[PDB]
Curated annotation (Swiss-Prot):
GO annotation (BP), single: response to amphetamine
Keywords, alphabetical: Cytoplasm, Glycoprotein, GTPase activation, Membrane, Nucleus, Phosphoprotein, Signal transduction inhibitor, Synapse, Synaptosome, Ubl conjugation
Complex and partners: Interacts with GNAI1 and GNAQ. Interacts with GNAZ and GNAI2. Interacts with OPRM1. Forms a complex with mu-opioid receptors and G(alpha)z/i2 subunits, including GNAZ and GNAI2; the formation of this complex results in mu-opioid receptor desensitization. Interacts with HINT1.
Organism for this UniProt entry: Homo sapiens
Annotated Gene Ontology cellular component terms: cytoplasm; neuron projection; nucleus; plasma membrane; synapse
Molecular function via GO: GTPase activator activity; GTPase activity
Localization annotation: Membrane; Synapse, Synaptosome; Nucleus; Cytoplasm
Location of the RGS domain: 13-129
Entire-sequence positions represented here: 72 to 206 of 210
PTM annotation (Phosphotyrosine): residues: Y66
Function: Regulates G protein-coupled receptor signaling cascades, including signaling via muscarinic acetylcholine receptor CHRM2 and dopamine receptor DRD2. Inhibits signal transduction by increasing the GTPase activity of G protein alpha subunits, thereby driving them into their inactive GDP-bound form. Binds selectively to GNAZ and GNAI2 subunits, accelerates their GTPase activity and regulates their signaling activities. Negatively regulates mu-opioid receptor-mediated activation of the G-proteins.
Name of the featured protein: Regulator of G-protein signaling 17
Amino acid sequence: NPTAEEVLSWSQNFDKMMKAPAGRNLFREFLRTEYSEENLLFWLACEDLKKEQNKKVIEEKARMIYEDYISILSPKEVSLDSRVREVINRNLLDPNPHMYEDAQLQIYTLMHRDSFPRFLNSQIYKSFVESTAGS
Ligand SMILES: [Ca+2]
Ligand SMILES: [Ca+2]
């Protein structure tokens, strides 16, 4: 169960927050307030895919990820460099569970550099810290 001090410690360590299930859930709540939650949803989907070996499951999950977050027509599309997308598009024709690893790192970095600082300045972050303090 995350304490006030744990929630506060995340302000100096994005990696620590992202390792914590509560860190990811609290961050997600914030991201939805600024309509950038697709980045984290994609990141989580990629984490889940990496744990699969069954070919049908890999195919179905890889294609779902593409359709939800990669296709230029998806409403939950994430922002990726053209070289990353090119390699994804080739891999889509023969899916493997590591095919989103580069895109995952790109989106992690985006979250770290762009939305994370805004999280730390948000009233919702203040309220998270204060909701777990026993004062
Ligand atoms: Ca959005
Ligand atoms: Ca396999």
